[PDB]
């Protein structure tokens, strides 16, 4: 084979349709389904799989008590077939760690996992299922990464890493990897002030990443990466439509080179597709908590600070629970453009439901279409009562 090259553009997005759904929590009521969190989706040339961080126990077991924690070090990155539940008998382990990212470059897969204490943390980069290279911690405070699919171009796969206070000016680095080796890295530049958990997609040469600002605002930062040059810039999405959670109620005028205030020290991972008049933004529906999920069509959201929605689609009702979301694309599909897709984590259990001692999620995913299709919401559908 050869490496994937990001030469096609993005398809016109008129509406979204169901791509996949595992119903992991419903199934897990009476089967050996693993407790997971922080899912993402990724596709190889002939297969799509779900990825998630496992807590090392089934939902129904007794070790699910206390899985609310983000790291226990019993945590690992696993992968299982699209729309099947993450069961104990069908999952493959990619690597071990409490934070991760992965992707396929056209020849093989790269996976990165971060493990260890909050101080002496470390990252191990795997390629073709073997460890290749490692990165130690530099700011000594929770080394962390994307929790999403990475995007490669001609073998080069840029990855965003953060190290430092989550309520302060943490540092940031971008590493450029090839076959698991480190070719270069850069300190973060541009006007974004704080970056965590980037969601990236490639298009017509170049990678766009939507990331989160957990320090000062509701206008998510964007990193624009040139994988050939191995250079980058950053800014915020100008649109007055705010996309983080919790967030302020929308203003008339947004901001571009500075975060938009009112909700400090918080936020949720999310995504956007930035393409001029073909621009779409994702966000929760409630401004107070992680519930609901919708897609809005907002022309020129990246640069127009007075732009507003002209269309949209509901994915999850505000009556349902939501979670982290992010983007992905199948870069080996036939056609003259890439079909944009995204996923949403649906969180059940703690911290919102106190009737159980665990936390878990179901996965729902959507892909775009050029047709105008109808809409339906997609609750995880589990009865919490059945676990009580």
């Amino acid at each position: 084979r050869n490496f994937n090259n990001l030469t096609k553009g993005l398809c016109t997005i008129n509406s979204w349709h169901i791509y996949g759904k595992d119903n992991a929590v419903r199934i897990g009521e009476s089967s050996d389904v693993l407790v997971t969190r922080e899912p993402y989706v990724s596709c190889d040339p002939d297969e799509c799989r779900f990825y998630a961080l496992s807590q090392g126990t089934t939902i129904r077991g007794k070790h699910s008590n206390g899985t609310i924690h983000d790291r226990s070090q019993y945590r690992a990155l696993i992968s299982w077939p699209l729309s099947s539940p993450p069961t104990v008998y069908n999952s493959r382990v990619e690597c071990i760690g409490w934070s991760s990212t992965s992707c396929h470059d056209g020849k093989s897969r790269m996976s990165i996992c971060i493990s260890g204490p909050n101080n002496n943390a470390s990252a191990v980069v795997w390629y073709n299922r073997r460890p290749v290279a490692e990165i130690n911690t530099w700011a000594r405070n929770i080394l962390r990464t994307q929790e999403s699919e990475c995007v490669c171009h001609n073998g080069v796969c840029p990855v965003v890493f953060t190290d430092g206070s989550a309520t302060g000016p943490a540092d940031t680095r971008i590493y450029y990897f090839k076959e698991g080796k480190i070719l270069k890295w850069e300190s973060l530049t541009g006007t974004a002030k704080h970056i965590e958990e980037c969601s990236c997609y490639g298009e017509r040469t170049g990678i766009t990443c939507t990331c989160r600002d957990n320090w000062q605002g509701s206008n998510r930062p964007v990193i624009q990466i040139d994988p050939v040059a191995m250079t980058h810039t950053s800014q915020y999405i100008c649109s007055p439509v705010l996309t983080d959670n919790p967030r302020p109620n929308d203003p008339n005028i947004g901001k571009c080179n500075d975060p938009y205030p009112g909700n400090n020290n918080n936020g949720v991972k999310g995504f956007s597709y930035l393409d001029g008049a073909n621009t779409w933004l994702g966000r929760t529906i409630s401004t107070a908590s992680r519930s609901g999920y919708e897609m809005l069509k907002v022309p020129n959201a990246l640069t127009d600070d007075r732009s507003k929605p002209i269309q949209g689609q509901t994915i999850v009702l505000n009556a349902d629970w939501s979670g982290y979301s992010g983007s992905f694309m199948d870069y080996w599909a036939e056609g003259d453009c890439y079909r944009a897709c995204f996923y949403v984590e649906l969180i059940r259990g703690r911290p919102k439901e106190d009737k159980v001692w665990w936390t878990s999620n179901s996965i729902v995913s959507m892909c775009s279409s050029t047709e105008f299709l109808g809409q339906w919401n997609w609750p995880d559908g589990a009865k919490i009562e059945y676990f009580l």
Partner: antibody
Amino acid sequence: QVQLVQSGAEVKRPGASVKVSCKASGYTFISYGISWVRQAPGQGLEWMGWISAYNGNTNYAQNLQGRVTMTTDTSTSTAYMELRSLRSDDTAVYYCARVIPGTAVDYFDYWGQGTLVTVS
Amino acid sequence: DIVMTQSPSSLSASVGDRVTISCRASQSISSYLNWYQQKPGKAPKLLIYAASSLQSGVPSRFSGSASGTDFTLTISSLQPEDFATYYCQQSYSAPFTFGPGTKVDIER
């Protein structure tokens, strides 16, 4: 915690100028715009003007032009406004406020306590 | 001259008694209208911006909407603490202007 702190009350005789400070805290000073309003006793809020966050271009209320100037000191995170050639009817409480876009006006959310200036 | 009026200029109501205050712009200012609350001796507080967006920290009892150039602020129940002069601000274009304000007093 975002706060705006203004200079205390002063009394001037007509023809004098007055400079009123407003110190910012809790946020990056240079990222937000500053504006002023004044409230004469028994009156509503009269907009004085608005100064842009990054370049200080300013915009003065027309009825005040020729008597008013605005400036900021980014090293002390302090905004200043000055009126010249004061008259007895310029008695008012002057308030400083912060505006969300720092490059456009859309919603002044933080207010100082107000500075009373008496002209007599 | 960006012109706006308030109506009622004054009113009163018993605590717990729901009220509405209106503002009318001459110009087609669209969504660019904010509402402020001022108590004696204090700098004005914000309640609503961009016509209907509530400011975080402001009680849920406050809400508003607009049609044409007519904007309203209303409440659900009337709080013992919300007797104040309310003002509309036209943020649409400089010079920015305020209406004269509406005073809500306590019914006696």
